[model samples]
Each structure stands twice: as structure tokens, then as C-alpha cells.
Target: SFIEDLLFNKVTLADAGFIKQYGDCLGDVAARDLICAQKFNG
Candidate 1:
């Protein structure tokens, strides 16, 4: 789902959906890292 959204440009690190799905959980840091990875590789 992360890579899917990344490929579609449907979400970003600053999006409410991004923070909502990511920032509100224990794996938030890893979630952000996936985007960090996308910023580099996507």
C-alpha cells in the first residue's frame, strides 16, 4: 500500500492521510522511512 500510493503520487509525507496512517502509530518512523525511500527511488 505504501509503494502503491508512492507510485500513484496519491500521498506525501505532509499529507493528512500520511500522518494519519503513519504518525499515529508505533511504526510511524518506518512509515516515514518508506517515503524517504520513495523520495530517493520512486
Candidate 2:
């Protein structure tokens, strides 16, 4: 049950198999490779 919630909302990635409420995300992953390639700082 916990995994279900996290996968649908918590996870902020597309290729991580979290494509329910967030959509297929196939387009998002295709645009860039890295997860946090823009905006985010290291």
C-alpha cells in the first residue's frame, strides 16, 4: 500500500515507473537524460 502512494505521488521521476497521476512521462524523459538537469542545484 505504501509503495502505491509513493509511486504515484512521492516519486518525482518518470522512468522510475511512476506514471499514474503524473502521466506516461515518456516525453519528459525523452527531452533530457539527467533527473535534475535544470533549476536544481548540487
Candidate 3:
């Protein structure tokens, strides 16, 4: 649902606090893909 949030709202990888807390919970590829989608779709 984190990725879903990015798709619909203003949340972004720039949220370093969030990334510090939960980024690791998303496996490496998922994290990378989420960021990639953000930059690509924007």
C-alpha cells in the first residue's frame, strides 16, 4: 500500500524519516521500483 500511496497522493521518497523507519520493510527491488515509478510517472 506504500506504493499505492505514492500513486495517489503527495507522499514521496523524499520523506527520509519514513524511509528510515520503514523503507527496509520493503525489499530492495520493491523500494527501487516504487521510486522508479514515482520519477517515471511524474
Candidate 4:
């Protein structure tokens, strides 16, 4: 059943799931090697 009359006085990020979507864009975790002049690879 749906509301007789929908009334949205205020709307925000709580709108859609696509609004809170995340993927494997970050392949791996970021890590930094010892002081061997190495830095984050991911």
C-alpha cells in the first residue's frame, strides 16, 4: 500500500542507494615500505 498523498517537506542524501554506492575502484590497501625510500603503491 502507498500513502494516500506523499508529502516531502525535506529531502537529502537519504534519497537513493545509488547515492551511497562504492566499487573496487581502490584495488588494494595503501601501504608504505620501510625507510628504504619506498612509498604507497596503492
Candidate 5:
């Protein structure tokens, strides 16, 4: 789902739908990074 959305440029963590669906739990990049470190680690 992420790969498909990324490839099509139709969705991402920033899209309105994504924000609406995930915003409350995940909050933002800063919050999500802390909550789930794998994506944020360099």
C-alpha cells in the first residue's frame, strides 16, 4: 500500500486522507518517529 501510493504519487503520510485517518494516533512526523523508530533511523 505504501509502495503503491508512493509510486503513483497519489498518497503519502502527508496526504489529507492520510492525515485524517492517521493524524490522531500518529500525530506527526516527530510523534511517529518516536513511536516507530525504524522509519526515522538514518
Candidate 6:
């Protein structure tokens, strides 16, 4: 699941390196914000 991936090492939503390599849809600012939100919620 998305949440699991984000929370675990399987995926890294907090950094731009992953975003740039994976063709991120959310862009930089948005991705950073979302990653922050998810971590905050946890």
C-alpha cells in the first residue's frame, strides 16, 4: 500500500532523489509536503 511504502524503506517519499528517478506526479514542493504530512500523522 502507499502508506506502507511511504513509511517503510521500500519507498522514500520524503526525498527528491526518488521523485526525480521515479517520474513523480506530485512534483517537488507537493511531494515534500505530503511526505511531511504522512510522517507527522504517524
**Clashes per candidate (backbone, < 3 Å):** 0, 0, 0, 0, 0, 0
Candidate 2 global CA lDDT score? 0.37
lDDT of 4: 0.21
> What lDDT tens digits, residue by residue, belong to model 6 across residues 1-42?
567555455335345346435543454656445445564335
The TM-score values for the models, in the order shown, are 0.25, 0.22, 0.25, 0.15, 0.25, 0.27
**Candidate 4 structure quality by residue, lDDT tens digits, 1-42:** 122112111113333223224322343422111111121111
Off by over 4 Å in 4: 1-15, 22-42
Summarize candidate 3's per-residue lDDT along 1-42 as a digit string, tens digits. Answer: 455566445435355345445444444556444444454344
Cα deviation of 38, candidate 4, in Å: 40
User: Which lDDT tens digits does candidate 5 get at residues 1-42?
Assistant: 344433224334345445345645453555333223333222
Top candidate on TM-score is 6
Q: Which pairs clash (backbone N, Cα, C closer than 3 Å) in model 2?
A: none
Write down the lDDT that model 6 would get: 0.48
Order the candidates by lDDT, highest first — what do you get? 1, 6, 3, 5, 2, 4
Local distance difference test, each candidate: 0.49, 0.37, 0.48, 0.21, 0.38, 0.48
Which residue runs does candidate 1 get wrong by more than 4 Å?
6-28
What CA RMSD would you report for each candidate?
A: 6.9, 10.2, 7.2, 18.7, 8.4, 7.3
**lDDT at 3, model 1:** 60
After best superposition, candidate 6 residue 2: deviation in angstroms?
4.6
Model 2 clash count equals: 0
- Output the better candidate (1/2) by TM-score: 1
Task: Give the per-residue Cα lDDT of candidate 3 at 36.
Answer: 48
